[PDB]
Amino acid sequence: LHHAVIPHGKGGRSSVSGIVATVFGATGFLGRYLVNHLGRMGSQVIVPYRCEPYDTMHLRPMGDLGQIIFMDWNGRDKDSIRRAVEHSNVVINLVGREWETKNFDFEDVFVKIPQAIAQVSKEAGVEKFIHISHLNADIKSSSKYLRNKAVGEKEVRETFPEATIIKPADIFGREDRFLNYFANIRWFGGVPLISLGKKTVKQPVYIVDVTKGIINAIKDPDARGKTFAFVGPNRYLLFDLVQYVFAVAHRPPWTTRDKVERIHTTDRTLPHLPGLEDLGVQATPLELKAIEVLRRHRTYRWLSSEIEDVQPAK
Amino acid sequence: VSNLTLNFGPQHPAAHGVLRLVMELSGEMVRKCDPHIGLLHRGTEKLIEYKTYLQALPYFDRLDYVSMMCNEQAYSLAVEKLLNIQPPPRAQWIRVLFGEITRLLNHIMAVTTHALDIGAMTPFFWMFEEREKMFEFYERVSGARMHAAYVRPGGVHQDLPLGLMDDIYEFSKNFSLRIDELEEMLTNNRIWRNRTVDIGVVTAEDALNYGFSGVMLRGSGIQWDLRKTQPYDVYDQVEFDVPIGSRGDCYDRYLCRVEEMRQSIRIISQCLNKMPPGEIKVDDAKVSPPKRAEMKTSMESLIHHFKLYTEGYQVPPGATYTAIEAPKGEFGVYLVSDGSSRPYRCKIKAPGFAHLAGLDKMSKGHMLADVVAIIGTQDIVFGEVDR
Amino acid sequence: TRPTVRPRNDVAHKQLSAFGEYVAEILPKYVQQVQVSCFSELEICIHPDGVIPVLTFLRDHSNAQFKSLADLTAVDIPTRQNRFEIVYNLLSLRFNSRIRVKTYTDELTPVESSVSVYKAANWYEREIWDMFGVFFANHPDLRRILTDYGFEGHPFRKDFPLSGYVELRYDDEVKRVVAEPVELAQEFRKFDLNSPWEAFPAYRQPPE
Amino acid sequence: GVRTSPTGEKVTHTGQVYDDEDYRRVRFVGRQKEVNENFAIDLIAEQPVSQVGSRVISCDGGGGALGHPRVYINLDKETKTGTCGYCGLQFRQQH
Amino acid sequence: TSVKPIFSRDMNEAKRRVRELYRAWYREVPNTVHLFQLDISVKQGRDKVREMFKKNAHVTDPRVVDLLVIKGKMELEETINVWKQRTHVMRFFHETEAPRPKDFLSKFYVGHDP
Amino acid sequence: ITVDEKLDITTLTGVPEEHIKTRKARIFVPARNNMQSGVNNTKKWKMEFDTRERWEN
Amino acid sequence: TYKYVNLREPSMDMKSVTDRAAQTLLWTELIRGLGMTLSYLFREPATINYPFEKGPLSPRFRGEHALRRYPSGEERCIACKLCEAVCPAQAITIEAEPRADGSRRTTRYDIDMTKCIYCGFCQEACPVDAIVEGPNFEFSTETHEELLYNKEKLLNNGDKWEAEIAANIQADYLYR
Amino acid sequence: ASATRLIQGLRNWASGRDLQAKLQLRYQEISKRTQPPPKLPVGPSHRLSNNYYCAR
Amino acid sequence: RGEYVVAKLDDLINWARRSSLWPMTFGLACCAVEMMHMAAPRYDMDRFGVVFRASPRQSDVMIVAGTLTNKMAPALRKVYDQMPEPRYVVSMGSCANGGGYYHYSYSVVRGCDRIVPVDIYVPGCPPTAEALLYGILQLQKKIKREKRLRIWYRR
Amino acid sequence: MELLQVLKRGLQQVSGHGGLRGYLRVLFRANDVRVGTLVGEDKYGNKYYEDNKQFFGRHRWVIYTTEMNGKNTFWDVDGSMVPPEWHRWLHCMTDDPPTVKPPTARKFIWTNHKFNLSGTPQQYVPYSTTRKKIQEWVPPSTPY
């Protein structure tokens, strides 16, 4: 054994597969799914967790035995992150709230934490480090978190040059914070957005496509040192989304223009970057999965739901 | 159209095992009930084929867990019968003793849990205290609480610890008083009675075709017993008498279980009086292991030890069906032996697997609220039914 | 032979031999082989036709009753031109006796509806279907007992390994229990316990 | 006071020590690696060499009915110490 | 070679009965996929049904055909009713089976003699 | 009865998964374990399968 | 013999049916009998405080799987594989490499307490009584990992208490 | 039982006669533990000169 | 300083919430009987405040006892899946805790981890009622150190 | 008339056992408050009490006290706090306490008998024994 060298048997549930890794965050959503694929293919996992002992139990069933091992840490001091990644095939980063809390700010959450964990990543002598951020991270203003995190990718690429720095677009799934938010914003006052109308082009991407993107990126060579993004394959919707996802599924602490300007951010940005198939994985249109996650209503009639089919100028 | 389809429920607070059920009914009345069994099925009979006789025996312990030493007695009698061996007398007597003790267990459970299901929170408590005394006996005997075997082919091993029969006597002394306390707790209660009187009756010949064997045939006409007719061990000798009932009414079956508890006290008593001090295991070194004193210091004892554990004794080929009286009724294993160490194919017979198939007819005439009592009345364990 | 050995009786032996012989005289059509175990349990072999006639008989005739069906089962034996032995095991209520009825079938050849004699045969037959796959002609119902609804493959038959071909687990992807090709943490270590020397000289077969 | 790896792991009476490369070592982070602090072999040389003025002797290994089964060991060759096959405690014939 | 055929003497009536069965399924696909609240489009489900028929299409002996038909009407007899939860009806679909490489040098590249 | 005489090779699709295509089955009479002398292990044909990989958990 | 119940003649004669209208009507049997036999309440209940008190047990009781060693500990286990051979759950593992001294012990001796049914067979089969079911039931691990025992954990279990097990074995070896 | 006055009269007056073996089993009759150490017999065979394994 | 209030209130909602913890008894197989003996008078549950009541909605925590077959498993996870969000799973018996005396054949699921996450594994076959009880107590002592709220205070 | 004996039982046990604060102490400690029964051979911090034999099943009882293994505190009471021999004699295993019949006092037994290691940084983690398997080959460091 050199580095986890010899996978065994049909992948998953005690099949060794290839990797060890680690996942920061993972206490909710995208990390949860990602670990579900890593353990689902049998690899060992290390999930460092916040001081909450209880809420991580939901992640237990997906690790078989002797895998998904837990340890305490906090992003402030080196030695914890140092201790977590000592033995790893790779390491990947998922971090940060969509709002600011007390001690933490939008700065240092996408800034200092990647600085540290990437620094000790290089010092630990580990390869294939994956780092993520939001799509259309730009030095230009109108989104605090976004200019910040853009500087995040700046330093993440400055130190530890070789790594996959990958921007998904608005990520879409079961427990996610985006489309569910639109479903829950319909309440009193009816003023979520469309203040000036239009002006918003957006292409949400369904989650399993993203996480499969990460797992191919992690186990496929020539995914290192190449930055690229994810794209909702077809939809590329206007605000007609809001009235769509509001139409289907019918009808029954946050933050300011940080949040509403966040969701109001508009761009698909730059065409030339390896999109999806350049990483070799299929893409999912919105419809079916949207039904799945939405549920609700009275459930008794399948009906049609009249797909939006914005595809403006597409 | 009308009717319905309703379903089971996951547990009552005492629930032993879970069934589903689908009852096509009329307004608060069940026209058709179709129990779905097989919910808890652990696939024992496929496992036994892979493990030698001495190994597969705990399966015959825990296939029906409530009554245990009885099932032990069934499988052991099967291997002895097919293997041409007799256990020494004292082994037979001990086996009888704990047989009827175990019968006292499964009966007191069936009755009490039948109460707790229906209502009547307390009798469960009063009597399962005494049941805890019973397991206090097992823990001395076999060195564990419930599933500990303490039964082999060719006789039991590890005879009673010195001073056990005193405790046995002491419990058996006043158990009569306490069970009579239950008989005042019930039996002339207008509630319990007036809930179960005519519910789920059976015609004798009908019970024969449906193959019910147990307190069923007892309480409904058709006087029959395996204990009396086909004595399988020294259990022949001791005197006692079985009850019956003429109403076939499911109340008779209750009272018959009771009187079988009392008679079980008689059998326990006489057994304590008759106990010969012969020995535990048979003396044939190749059927059953030697005790350690002979094991060490003596060569052939060592060999028969070592092989009798690794390979295990070989049983000549033959097909046997043995049947005993177990507190749920007639229980039996059909052994099929290639001349070998391992068994080959052995299908146990679960009385619950028969009795359960009868709910179709038995429950045809009473609404579901008493379909509760219809299921609970015939002693049944869904761990034994499935297998 | 006095201690340690079961004393055997020749009374029940002669009686049961007489009775089986009798059955052979009265039913020449279906009867093939009538034997008595040396521990005295009569066992009758029957062609896979007269199961209905033979059992209709053994329930009646007033010189035999067998009102109660003890247990219905089967044994999966490869090496035979017919894989299975359907074993009817009966209980005589009046006379204190039990006799067995063996019949055979392959996979495709059905055995026809023993229900019409004994109601107790109702579930035993279904359980046989699910766990083996012997089909039963015009049974009032056929369903799955003891196995999962979507399950397949008739487990008890030796073609089916100890473990299954599937497992269950749960994952936050689909929010439902799923199935994956069986993967054991431990190999299920296999043992060869069968020793040479033919411990039993009697049952030996002629070599060829 | 067991021989300790350069990593700090305590090797065992059958040396299991992991290699610095092996990822599996991470399972000991934050939790103790358990090993019996008292080796077996170290207690064999602890024992004196028993001597018997007879030619052929027995070992019950701690008394009757508790211990290993009897075996008679041959002390004829005195250029080595005849050892029990169960206990491991040597014997010699005195001179 | 003797035999006791079951519901049909020749492959003709076999083909007849399997046509019947496929009619039944094609009836009750929408009612089920709506009934357990599956996420599959009726078209897709039907396609998997006809697929599962096509998998066995190479059989000849009408005993075997008839027996398979008994299997079919049995499982359909369980899905027409509620006896089978969302789980198994999904379990026909394989979402959580990882895609198995069927091309050689990919198989060789990993599986070492599957 | 109308026995319906029929001639074709018997095959079974009512049994497990795609393992049928890949694996070859072996028939033999196991040769006596040499370190013992006796034949009762022999005399009965057996069927075992091509083995497959195993790893250290 | 048959002794049967409920076959009786209810008397429709007077002085029986008096107490039948009294019985149905006034609930005397119900009230008196039941309410009073519960008013049997006052007997001191049987309850035991488990942290501070413990129920009875037996010298043959079966706890957890401690390995034993001789005086001047030799690792009493010879490696002879029996305890693994008779394990009805198959859960044991033994791999034995002859060590420096030439005597044979086990490299990896493992148990899955999950799989383990707590037979007692491995306690009977051991020729030297190396492994014995402990007196102590001490359990409730927080992970499925922790219930799998190395040879090492079984040793340390044996060192934690022996004179315990020595008292039990010394008591009951006459029975076995 | 524990010292009981007028409540044991209540119990004597409800459910009838009692006080033989209080339901709780807590009063003596515990056998001590094995005053003698056990010594067990051995049945037929276990004897030279009588037997050859063929007969028995 | 309010962190004193934080820790104190933690010991309040925690103190009570653990002091009661009345679960539901799933009770598949012969471990269920032993559990009932924990509910018997001798070993009685009630002293510790644990109450016996049956419904997954009222259920504080769940005891998986008995052998878990493939056929039962989905229903089990549903019973888990309509439950008060704070919840805990105690695996009783050698079977459910990793497969026990079967662990093989097919119909039985191996461990109850493969279905729902688990907290207290109590071995035994059956675990002696005392042992099961010790498992519940140790679960309480896992409830003590939850320290759940002051990390919601994010310090 | 009779009740005075009862209130003298309670008054006696609370008076002699623990004193003024002792009744509250033992009461909240263990909700079972018993008459002081003999001594019970203290050994470690935990003190033992063997009843006069007044009744079975609740024969004997214990207070675990505090500080065991220089770890935890009181209020943590559970099993395994008893050492091995008191585990034997407390469970009815044997009717003879450890001081009257002493243990064999072997040299290699633990002198601590520490707590219960579940949880905490001190915890048992299972792992593979033996030694590697196949001893992979290595290339020579000298080119050509």
Ligand SMILES: CCCCCCCCCCCCCCCCCC(=O)OC[C@H](COP(=O)(O)OCCN)OC(=O)CCCCCCCCCCCCCCCCC
């Ligand atoms: C001289 C001038 C004229 C004077 C005239 C005086 C005439 C007096 C004649 C008697 C007066 C009435 C006596 C009480 C009658 C009450 C109603 C009754 O009789 O109920 C009985 C009834 C019978 O049940 P069952 O046999 O199923 O029904 C027959 C239907 N064919 O139902 C039952 O038996 C079942 C009821 C069970 C209820 C549950 C159990 C209750 C237990 C506690 C009850 C006692 C509570 C006492 C009060 C507490 C303090 C307030």
Ligand SMILES: NC(=O)C1=CN([C@@H]2O[C@H](COP(=O)(O)OP(=O)(O)OC[C@H]3O[C@@H](n4cnc5c(N)ncnc54)[C@H](OP(=O)(O)O)[C@@H]3O)[C@@H](O)[C@H]2O)C=CC1
């Ligand atoms: N809509 C979206 O959310 C989109 C997100 N992304 C990117 O994907 C990433 C992952 O998304 P998602 O799964 O929703 O992330 P989550 O916010 O749901 O999960 C991250 C976890 O890490 C914890 N965490 C890590 N560092 C800190 C810290 N310093 N302070 C507090 N908590 C911390 C969080 O809180 P706790 O400490 O309590 O565990 C949480 O448990 C995002 O960070 C973003 O870069 C991209 C596009 C869209």
Ligand code: SF4
């Ligand atoms: S008690 Fe446990 S280790 Fe011993 S034989 Fe039984 S299952 Fe195996």
Ligand code: SF4
């Ligand atoms: S039976 Fe005893 S000596 Fe033999 S391998 Fe097992 S523990 Fe070791």
Ligand code: SF4
């Ligand atoms: S662990 Fe043992 S007692 Fe519990 S359910 Fe399984 S077989 Fe029964």
Ligand SMILES: [Zn+2]
């Ligand atoms: Zn020796």
